[PDB]
């Protein structure tokens, strides 16, 4: 209640405050830019001088701000990567560990980002908890602003709850986003801007592929769109539709464009009508400030957002996810790495399962159908190793050569089909290839 008082017991420097962060323990953090940088600094430099050991950290959705810090590749013997999603960062990282004697530095962490909340807080317990939150306000509260998503939780749920103060955070309404400071344990103050996602060139092909999947959305569809420059691209098109609503698992400047042009109004869905839902957010700085007391825009946690049941509630749900290869059975592939499998954890998935279920509902899953000026097919015979969508999941697949519902088709049916949205340079080998496994 004396809220002035609480702060000042409370501020402090960042290396005071990661200063009690016991060896052997567990922490967690923000996603992307709500990863504290100061915090993260002070972190990183108490392993540099040795004075801490066997510190496991777990993530998802990894920035710069920590690929830099905590995650310094020199640091790994004492800071411990439980990465549970792996980007750019994670790559980098591994591929160096190989190749210095064949050592393994990252520690993946298998799950479903809609089990992270209860994951996090529950099988494996989180001692320390790192968050960039916007100022407080009058009535003592800080905001997660940009996150929710695993962080409402775990911010609630670990032994300690450590905030770094920054007026460039967005104070964001949603559900468990606002966190009083008799809640937390330690404040620092950082005001520097967030970071960005680098906004993407468009390649041509997504001028095709954002046509088709304008057709697919009908009246009143309620959004989701995945990560990656293609998702946000498609919003453009949909600049002269209404009444469209918003339940995605990550805001980007697309959706949020569409919010500022009234194209979204949210009045057709079931669940959180008027107000668009994010689990959390990526963008520029522009978007970041927009977000800054937006009655309309209502962050909440992921267990909820990424929910399959929750999302098929809302009518006419358009989930729009990118992938990387689609092989011959319509299987999906969004991962990276050859021969490895780690972005099933990243909850693409749950809009593929809750958009199909949805009333009206429309799952969509598009790339182009080539890489590397055009001479590598990302329509393939076979995905080697675990794939992010099964085959028995994926509703719509779309390339710049058009869109094909696998819903209910069998072998034969999805290989034939599939086989056209192929660039017309590999349809043939893909052909002979249907044939060897036996497809066609």
């Known amino acids: ?42 972190l990183a430099d108490r392993a540099t001088r040795g004075d801490i050991g066997d510190l496991r950290v777990y993530y998802f959705e990894t920035a710069k701000i ?8 020199e640091l790994n013997n004492r800071i411990k990567p439980y990465s549970m999603f792996v980007t750019a960062v994670e790559r980098a990282l591994i591929r160096r560990g190989i190749e210095d004697g064949g050592r393994k530095v990252v520690n993946y962490v298998p799950s479903n980002f809609h089990q992270a909340p209860r994951l996090l807080a529950e099988e494996i317990g989180i001692d ?42 967005p104070r964001v309404q949603g ?6 400071i008799s809640e937390v344990d330690a404040i620092v103050e950082n005001h520097v801007p967030l970071i960005e996602m680098p906004v993407r060139s468009a390649i041509p092909e997504y001028t095709s592929i954002s046509h088709i999947i304008a057709d697919l959305v009908p009246d009143g569809a309620c959004l989701q769109m995945g990560v990656g420059a293609l998702p946000n691209l498609v919003c453009g098109v949909l600049k002269d539709r209404n009444d469209l609503g918003i339940h995605t698992a990550v805001l980007n400047p697309g959706l949020v464009d569409l919010i500022r042009r009234g194209v979204v109004t949210n009045q057709r869905k079931t669940l959180d009508r008027g107000r668009s839902v994010f689990t959390f957010a990526m ?12 009655p309309a825009i209502f962050s909440r946690p992921v267990d909820y957002v990424n929910d399959p049941h929750i999302i098929a509630q809302n009518d006419n749900v358009v989930s729009i996810n990118a992938t990387l290869q689609i092989d011959l059975t319509g299987a999906c592939n969004s991962e990276h790495m050859l021969g490895h ?3 099933a954890s990243g909850g693409q998935l749950d809009f593929v399962r809750g958009a199909y279920a949805s009333k009206g509902g429309r799952s969509i899953i598009a790339t182009p159908s080539t890489a ?4 590598v097919s990302r329509i393939i015979p076979r995905i080697d190793g675990p794939v992010t969508t099964p085959r028995i999941d994926t509703h719509y697949i779309v390339t710049e050569f058009g869109a094909v519902n696998l819903k209910g088709l069998s072998s034969t049916e999805r290989a034939l089909r599939i086989i056209e949205l192929a660039h017309p340079d590999f349809r043939d080998e893909l052909t002979q290839a249907a044939k060897k496994m036996h497809l066609i």
Do not use: W
């Open 66 to 73: 920590a690929g830099d810090t905590i995650l310094r590749y």
């Open 175 to 180: 559900e468990a986003a606002a966190i009083h």
């Open 372 to 375: 590397a000026k055009g001479t």
């Open 341 to 343: 499998q780690y972005s």
């Open 283 to 294: 963008g520029q700085q522009e978007m970041y400030e927009y977000l800054n007391d937006h």
């Open 128 to 169: 320390t908890f790192m968050h960039t939150v916007s100022p407080m306000d009058c009535h003592g509260y800080f905001s997660l602003g940009v996150g929710n998503d695993y962080s409402s939780r775990i911010a609630r749920s670990a032994r300690r709850f450590i905030v770094e103060v920054n007026r460039y955070m």
């Open 1 to 42: 209640m004396d809220i002035r008082a609480l702060y000042d017991e409370k501020l402090t420097t960042p290396e005071e405050a990661v200063s009690s962060i016991a060896s052997g323990s567990h922490l967690s953090m923000g996603m992307f830019a709500a990863e504290p940088p100061a915090l993260l600094k002070a």
